Amino acid sequence: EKVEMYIKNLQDDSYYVRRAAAYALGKIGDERAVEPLIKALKDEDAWVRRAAADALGQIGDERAVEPLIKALKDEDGWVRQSAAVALGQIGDERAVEPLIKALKDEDWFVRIAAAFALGEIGDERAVEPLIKALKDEDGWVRQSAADALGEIGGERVRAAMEKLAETGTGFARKVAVNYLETHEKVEMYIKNLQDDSMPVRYDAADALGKIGDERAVEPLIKALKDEDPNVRASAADALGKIGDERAVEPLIKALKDEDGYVRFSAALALGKIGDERAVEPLIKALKDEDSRVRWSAAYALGQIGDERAVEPLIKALKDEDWQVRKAAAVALGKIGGERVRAAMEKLAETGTGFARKVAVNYLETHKS
Numbered sequence: 001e002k003v004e005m006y007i008k009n010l011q012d013d014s015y016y017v018r019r020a021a022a023y024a025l026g027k028i029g030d031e032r033a034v035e036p037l038i039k040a041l042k043d044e045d046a047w048v049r050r051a052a053a054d055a056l057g058q059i060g061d062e063r064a065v066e067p068l069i070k071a072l073k074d075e076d077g078w079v080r081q082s083a084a085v086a087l088g089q090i091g092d093e094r095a096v097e098p099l100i101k102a103l104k105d106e107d108w109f110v111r112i113a114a115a116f117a118l119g120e121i122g123d124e125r126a127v128e129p130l131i132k133a134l135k136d137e138d139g140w141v142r143q144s145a146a147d148a149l150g151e152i153g154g155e156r157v158r159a160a161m162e163k164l165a166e167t168g169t170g171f172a173r174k175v176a177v178n179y180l181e182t183h184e185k186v187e188m189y190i191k192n193l194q195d196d197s198m199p200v201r202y203d204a205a206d207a208l209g210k211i212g213d214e215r216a217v218e219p220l221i222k223a224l225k226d227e228d229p230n231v232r233a234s235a236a237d238a239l240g241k242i243g244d245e246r247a248v249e250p251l252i253k254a255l256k257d258e259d260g261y262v263r264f265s266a267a268l269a270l271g272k273i274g275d276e277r278a279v280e281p282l283i284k285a286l287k288d289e290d291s292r293v294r295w296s297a298a299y300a301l302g303q304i305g306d307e308r309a310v311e312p313l314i315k316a317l318k319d320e321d322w323q324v325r326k327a328a329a330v331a332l333g334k335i336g337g338e339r340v341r342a343a344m345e346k347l348a349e350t351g352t353g354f355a356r357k358v359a360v361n362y363l364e365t366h367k368s
């Protein structure tokens with residue numbers, strides 16, 4: 001209930017309250033705040049855009065990716081840097097080619113952020129550009145590419161480190177020689193899913209989801225029954241990104257978890273998967289104790305597009321929570337059947353307040 005003031009305060013005329021919203025959404029915000037924070041990225045204030053990138057990466061939702069890739073071409077250097085670090089933290093491979101370009105950014109601190117990003121994604125296409133980055137004019141940029149080659153650490157790395165220790169000059173040489181003096185991936189993380197330490201399990205689920213390999217499905221389904229709810233919810237998100245339809249049934253079981261964040265993550269995942277069998281259980285999740293879960297239920301039913309949620313969403317237009325209503329209105333928009341039209345005209349004439357207001361609007365939008 002702190003979140004919704006900030007979400008609304010994201011479109012406020014004042015540029016001082018936009019900043020405090022974005023700032024706070026960086027600390028508190030969750031998946032509900034990405035579509036708004038994605039819009040915040042188009043602001044006039046560079047502080048609002050920056051803080052919005054900062055938060056999108058902290059939230060870590062894949063929808064922020066094509067937007068943050070455009071924010072990499074922002075006029076403000078510190079907004080470019082935020083966009084780079086955020087793509088870093090989301091771990092989506094589509095950022096790699098444009099993060100490589102940012103590796104030659106006019107500003108030193110942007111190059112550092114691009115190097116770090118490329119390190120954290122661990123895609124191998126960055127190894128050569130990263131190796132070329134060791135000869136950058138700025139020592140700190142060179143140092144950041146060193147650390148990013150370390151993070152990736154493939155055989156492509158060791159290959160380039162050998163060639164450099166054999167042949168290179170200056171810092172690049174120093175780095176390669178030290179590399180030698182001190183010294184596939186999916187399978188390591190699947191094993192880490194079964195680790196005793198909780199952070200190792202969590203990070204494993206995080207990792208497998210970003211990687212997106214279908215190997216990880218059956219082990220992540222198992223992590224849905226994890227001791228710890230943070231791990232439980234990470235494995236659900238990861239299953240959502242992977243998109244493998246084998247998680248559908250065990251995800252429907254996560255819709256009845258003790259933890260609200262696991263339930264929330266399970267529903268968002270089922271909408272991404274888009275399988276019809278989530279419709280019934282998601283409909284029953286629009287009546288949840290938790291206003292986040294009720295939101296995710298509407299959103300996912302939006303993604304799925306099945307007409308059996310029309311009236312449960314109409315009902316959801318009168319939810320106590322503001323943005324659950326907003327989500328249900330969006331969802332009826334996506335579905336958009338001949339059914340939805342007829343429901344909306346009834347609601348135009350007989351509705352009250354918010355539900356009436358969006359029933360009127362829907363009808364205005366769908367005319368030509």
Ligand code: NA
Binds near residue numbers: 050
């Ligand atoms: Na900022």
